[PDB]
Symmetry: D2
């Protein structure tokens, strides 16, 4: 089968021909219908040799949808041909966190050598992929695979970050979304569907502010030095109830601390090495909590899929072949994909 | 192997010799160390022939603990010899409820023909038992098996019922426990461990009021017509924040409605055919919710086990052999077991 | 001043001329701009003489909005001319419930002789009214008074009932609304604004099903014997996550019990003497809670007003003069007001 | 009357003779029975002249209990002689936060010139004090005033910090308490009363580790570089579910980040200028939230009082006269008071 792999340290990924795998007991083989491109795949390829420990070769792609091709021994609950999304952050399945479906916060996965697809285990950028367990598949019915692949991380991650503080986002609340890309443009639409919060979007690029307005933001403001004062002019001086930072650079976190309300929330979702919120007295308002969330829970992926099936999420994508995989990663590095890149085998 | 089975409709259970089973893919064989006796086994044996559909024969026992004897193909996460409790209310493992570990509220188990051990699938009253999946086992370490078997239902069910309204039970709150038997005497101890609620126990029998005080109730009162006024004398006339009725007879539910506070809770846990709360205006205080909960979640069983391991639960038991199984069920019918009956093979 | 009063037992209310009151210390005098008509005013007038204890005469109207006319001694936080809604369910202000703004569940108001406006204290169906305390006023800014008066009960009561179980109403959930009148037509719009639940409306009258669709219900079905099966055909057989019954007749509660999902909720909001849910095993699904809520909290009234100011609530009203008050109550008895009746002085 | 006042910038507080005040409309005069000494009074006296804006003179003491001496015009709900604790963080009483009793997070108090007693308004270190409003008094019944004064901040602040994440602290959880002084020794006892968490105390001083064990900590460990690993040896490697840092120095926050579990919580309660948590990827575990809470809510003070009345809180105090006030502040600066200092007029 054709696959896109990271083969040596520092080099760009290449297209290869490798064996189609076979499912052992409890496993499921999927024929891949769509694989998302995210910055997690870039992060893995930008590690120095001394820090890298995901193995070589590594099939990329941690966002994946497909159809069930073959069932391993003892697997029931799915038939051949069933369309399914892959739950990405694989946990042990047995700890207190995993027992509530919160495998994203599994306290044992590191020690057991359980790694997610595309980040240690083979990913979705191939004609076929193995899924370790039935509990990591979610049915998608007749949802278009191209629009569904982004739901497994571009949808799941913002959905989770929002869900952690949903009781704060009542009528009269304000939510700020910083960064209107793959994650951010889906986050705006989740906020509108599951809350009555007023939504203010922030980005560097005028074209991304246009995208923000297209997907339902109430206002959109230019990022940088003027952003904090512009956000406060919109909120009448009270501050934003919640800030969802999908950039996570030091300057965007600083903006978040300058606009968050007393008893509010900052969610640092975007990943920039070294950047951090400074949570201490006189540096942040009283009662304003801060967290770096990771991925999402099993039930949250099901809820994101239910939003898509009800017509509440317009996912903006650009489609690539497997041969175009390397080129699509270059496009992702330069920030020229409007929404989520998706590879179709 | 020796086992206690229901073999014909209307007759008492008998001791039999049947095949020791073999675990298929995904399954685990346990050597049973302790099996609890509950009223669910009685309910099953008291069904008329036209209503019964659990199959004959049926190995009894839906409360169970054991040691892992054999792993079926593909099972990891457990080694041979590991001491484990069985999670009883088996769900499909795939629906929204099951994805949060709430298999007690699985919306699909009926349609798929998934039945709990002792209530359609073979139970724990035997030398060995099959468990369908690794996710239905919880490690217990060096906990005494006899004191651990009751935790799987006598512990789990009250823990769940309490957990549904735990935020109501702050300092200054009052919780009433009606019925101090297998479930009720564990429920009192859970309330004391996980809340600052004042606990008032209610029973017909002076010996059970003594048990209530032994396990930490702040007061204990006689059941019947005078119970409502006696409870109100203890609460200064304000009413009880929550009432956990582990009897569920019409007279105890009536008492619960007469004592519950405004914005309080009644949990109807005990099962008496035909009995029901009457929830309407002028029949119950404003904002007082009522529910019939069932069993508990996976994470809740783990929490109950953590309470036992920390020394917070003194489980009162009487021990029987497998040969004494039929006799022990007669003892349970007449209400002469002080706490939970447990069979040890 | 002109006012509409209940003057003798069994008779219809009459228009009268009475003294304009003066505010004592802590009190505020409002010039009334709009007063809602609800069934609470009917209930008060339909009491037998032996049960009635609200005093005679009694100025009707427990839904009220106005402008601050005069401040009593020591009152700050409002200026003359400020537009305000009246928080209806007056509590003691000092107990545990009142300290969280939950004055609807005040445990002391009965014993202290604190009565709501229109139900023991003089109501809003007059040119002026006294409000006891500053904490019972909520600013409405430039909101149209006619559309704002219904918010104080037709808005507040459904908002509260929904808020009690909002975490259940995620994407993929279904909420059933029974009765599309004053409360029900606002309840549909609250569900759409603060959740992603699919909304199914139920009523006897085809004209009210039309109203339901106008205000955003996803489906609307005829009430009565066929309603349960019709609701289950729409939910694919799974049942409704929550049922909000704004009728509360025995037949509608029965329908609610036949459609509610496992681990769901029934809110009995409508008031029909004698009617009640029957909460017991085999009469309702496992884990399905039932409650009769009353009115709402202070913070909830503020949130309802914030929804109105954001344009999320289209309140259907018919306007009457004070002279037309008696006639408007006859219209309310026969069910010929489409939405909420409102009196404008 | 005698009082302890800050009279000029940079100087120590002095004992003075000033007028006994009279209560205006809505106000209550208390005869003070006990006044706590906290670091908030130190912070106020250590401000440079250009930053100080609380006025001179300033009567110190923001922890206070007393008996009602005189009622201002229009005040009901209290009789002369009633024993009461003062709710410290005075809010406007009208905003969304204040309507839920969360006056600690009032968004409007600054703009309205409402200041707490001892921090802008006259405090409790005097024979008498004015309280602005009846809603800022909580009845204490026959509680010893000396043990009750600390409850208003040493009790309230930890109770609030704990309450924000109480659902995380189930059986099997671990809570770390850093700093066993006024706040910390009460925080340990709250954790034991309202949760089943294992409690690990941390301090620099062996005498304070002894105090931790006296008030019910399950273990006590020396602070500094080895504290992290010592806490992990006690938790079997999993990390602490929640860390309550009542010191808030950079070294204790660093310790907190090294021990907190995935999906856990750090509460930075102690105040050290410049110190802060660093919340960013690779510096803190996934999902671990951080906050600086302030004081507590009205309902939380009531709950703390209910804990004291049930015998769940042993408050360690040292008693001083008003003449000893200045000396007692010197003792507080050098850290030589074992628990909470309390002044008795
Ligand atoms: N926490 C998690 O589990 C998780 C999961 C997935 C992705 N991520 C991270 O989220 C981030 C976003 O991912 P994506 O796929 O949506 O990225 P993307 O490239 O699709 O979009 C980036 C967007 O951010 C904007 N942007 C860049 N710098 C900005 C600034 N200073 N101010 C405002 N806007 C700015 C860009 O204009 C663009 O609109 C990445 O850092 C990624 O690593 C985190
Ligand atoms: N909802 C669930 O998931 C669930 C799970 C397990 C058991 N149950 C049910 O819980 C109930 C109790 O189970 P158990 O094993 O504790 O029973 P048990 O026989 O061990 O205990 C019964 C106790 O209730 C007391 N009692 C009986 N009638 C009473 C009355 N009118 N007033 C006060 N006290 C009275 C008895 O003296 C005894 O102490 C049963 O009805 C059982 O079927 C429900
Ligand atoms: N719990 C509370 O705090 C509270 C507060 C306010 C009102 N209420 C009660 O709520 C109820 C509704 O109040 P409202 O002012 O909206 O009434 P309304 O007269 O404005 O509307 C009643 C609606 O119910 C419909 N209806 C009647 N019988 C029905 C049936 N069997 N099935 C389906 N639909 C039916 C009617 O067609 C009508 O549209 C009243 O009983 C009132 O007393 C309760
Ligand atoms: N956030 C709030 O609302 C709030 C409210 C009240 C007090 N506070 C603050 O809380 C802190 C504690 O107040 P308190 O009155 O209990 O103080 P305290 O002086 O009574 O207690 C200090 C305790 O901390 C210990 N300690 C000091 N430095 C330490 C270190 N580096 N490592 C470990 N332990 C150390 C001491 O040995 C002592 O046990 C202060 O900073 C105070 O300003 C905050
Ligand atoms: Zn990603
Ligand atoms: Zn795990
Ligand atoms: Zn049972
Ligand atoms: Zn299921
Ligand atoms: Zn009404
Ligand atoms: Zn009250
Ligand atoms: Zn303090
Ligand atoms: Zn306020």
């Amino acid at each position: 089968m054709k696959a896109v792999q990271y083969t040596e340290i520092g080099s760009e990924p290449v297209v290869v021909d490798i064996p189609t795998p076979t499912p052992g007991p409890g496993e499921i083989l999927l024929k891949v219908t769509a694989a998302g491109l995210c910055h997690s795949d870039i992060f893995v390829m930008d590690m120095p040799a001394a820090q890298y420990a995901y193995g070589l070769p590594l099939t990329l792609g941690h966002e994946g949808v497909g159809t069930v091709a073959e069932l391993g021994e003892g697997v029931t609950g799915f038939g051949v041909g069933d369309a399914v999304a892959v739950y990405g952050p694989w946990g042990c399945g047995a700890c207190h966190a995993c027992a509530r479906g919160r495998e994203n916060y599994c306290t044992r996965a590191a020690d057991l050598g359980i790694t997610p697809p595309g980040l240690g285990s083979p990913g979705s950028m191939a004609e076929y992929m193995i899924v370790d367990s039935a509990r990591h598949l979610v049915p998608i019915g007749d949802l278009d695979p191209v629009a569904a692949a982004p739901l497994t991380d571009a949808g799941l991650t913002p959905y989770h970050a929002i869900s952690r503080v949903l009781p704060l986002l009542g009528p009269g609340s304000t939510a700020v979304v910083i960064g209107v890309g793959g994650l951010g443009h889906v986050g705006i639409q989740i906020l509108r569907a599951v809350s009555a919060a007023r939504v203010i979007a922030v980005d560097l690029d005028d074209d991304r502010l246009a995208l923000a307005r297209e997907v339902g933001a109430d206002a959109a403001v230019k990022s940088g030095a003027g952003a904090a004062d512009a956000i406060r002019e919109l909120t009448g001086g009270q501050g934003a109830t919640a800030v969802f930072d999908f950039v996570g650079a030091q300057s965007t976190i600083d903006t978040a601390q300058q606009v968050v309300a007393v008893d509010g929330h900052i969610s640092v979702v975007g990943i920039h090495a070294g950047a951090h919120a400074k949570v201490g007295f006189f540096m942040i308002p009283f009662g304003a909590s801060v967290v770096t969330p990771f991925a999402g829970t099993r039930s949250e992926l099901m809820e994101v899929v239910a939003l898509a099936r009800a017509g509440r999420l317009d996912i903006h994508t650009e489609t690539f072949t497997l041969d175009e995989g390397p080129a699509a990663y270059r496009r992702l590095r330069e920030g020229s994909i409007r929404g989520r890149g998706v590879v179709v085998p």
